[PDB]
């Protein structure tokens, strides 16, 4: 079972968190978990009017039961004034390793399942742990055969 | 409250809807009601494969009394009878009548007209307004500073 | 080749077109070309504030180098202060079988190919002969694979 | 002129169109996303081409342009990313910043197309680029009441 995510929807889940990080002037920048919170950040950049956006590259390769991750860019700070975001939490494992990076910064996330929704500052939409979230990026308008070929 | 509805996310429960419909060849057609349902319908027509598509047109007129501008020919038997959704099932009674055999449906249902239809995919609570795609469109939105 | 045209541009077209067949008290009603008539019917419908709208369903059939035409259901009259709609002319076949059944009809669709364009009586975009238009309602947001597997 | 209307839709294809010239992906160490223009187009071509390292490049004005803070490096083997250069004001001040930066943008006016390596589409030099993160789905009475 699929959790589809348009765009539309995104932008409005995108504009409901950042009306709750008002105001604007509290936040020194945001700091974007690339590459999923690529999109909501920049949402949220437009939206508070802050031109400060850095990013936190982690690339994280699964093998068999354990998880080989590493920072290939790093954002210099705490967090102490700014605003981290990525665009969900699933298991919880991305978010331990950010909070434990930037342990003074706002971490905020659009969708947030059980598991990792104690790591989160705060969060849109709640998603059941065992429902896929598929991402607008990810996806694409293309030819759909009808159902019956009718 | 308010139930924003884009065009994909009604396009998306429109095909499940189709899926329940299946197999097409035991439809003759289907007759939208004007005009919620002519969107519908039209994503029905094209998933199912259905090029017979009519229509049944409805104006309101105290009391509130029910005008009948246009109506599509039979009493519904082998069609089926498409409206976007059913808040109360005023309007859905005087389709009920007029095809009784028809196999009413819609995408969006509320709790008090529920009863009234044979099939529909989303469930809206009742003091929940659907905004549905036609009536919206993509606009310069000021940000939120 | 191909045009792609998404929910949010035909929308825009529709609108467009609306606003040329103002005042609405000159039209009496919406008679659509099922299928593809059904959608730019119902956007027209609701900008114009039309409640009466009919349909006219004709199947084809393409035998070799002949067209096989056989009129499903026709709405009534000859389509005086009627506005017939549908979404495209390609080569103007179903243009012209349409405008002889509805001879006092506005005929206007959203796209037009060279070939039609002089049979309709105002359209909204001009499509080359050579380009196929990819319709919203034959299309879905789906997933698609990276262009690449890094 | 007028408003040249830009949705998710199309920047998305766009984005993808640009992508494929970007091919093949190991040729680039990683993608510089020009804040805030760039970080939507920025985010697509990261997806498209699997590049893990995307970094960024703030800048502010006051006109003398003010560097908020900016990526590593002479852009040796990364692509600068923005969404548009109209009369190339912030692009000279990129390409002066990371010279061996393949720079590349989606759209394109006649006054900034010669200072960039690539682009998709050719926009008016009087023609104003509503993009998706400025517009939003909302209800548009209807033109007749
Ligand atoms: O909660 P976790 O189980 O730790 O995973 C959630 C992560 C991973 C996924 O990104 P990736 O799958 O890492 O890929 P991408 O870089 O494209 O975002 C998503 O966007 C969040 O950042
Ligand atoms: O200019 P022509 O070459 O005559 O074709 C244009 C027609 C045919 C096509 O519909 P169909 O392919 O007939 O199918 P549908 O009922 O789904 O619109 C399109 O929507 C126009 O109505
Ligand atoms: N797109 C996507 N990526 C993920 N990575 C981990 N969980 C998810 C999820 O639900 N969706
Ligand atoms: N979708 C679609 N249907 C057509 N039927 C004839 N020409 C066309 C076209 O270009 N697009
Ligand atoms: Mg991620
Ligand atoms: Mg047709």
Known sequence: EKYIV???????HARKL?????????????????????????????????????????????????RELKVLKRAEGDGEGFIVI?????????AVAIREMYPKAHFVTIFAKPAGRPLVDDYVVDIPQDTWIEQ???????????????
Chains 1, 3 share one sequence.
């Not at 348009?6 to 409005?12: K, S």
């Open 18 to 66: 950042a009306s709750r990080l008002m105001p604007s002037e509290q936040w020194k920048g945001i700091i974007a978990v690339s590459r999923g919170g690529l999109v909501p950040g920049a949402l949220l950049a437009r939206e508070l009017g802050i031109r400060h956006v850095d990013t936190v590259c982690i690339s994280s390769y699964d093998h068999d039961n354990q």
């Open 6 to 12: 348009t765009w539309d929807m995104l932008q409005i």
């Open 136 to 150: 607008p990026w990810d996806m694409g308008v293309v030819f759909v055969p009808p159902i019956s070929g009718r």
């Open 86 to 94: 990525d665009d969900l939490v699933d298991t919880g494992g991305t």
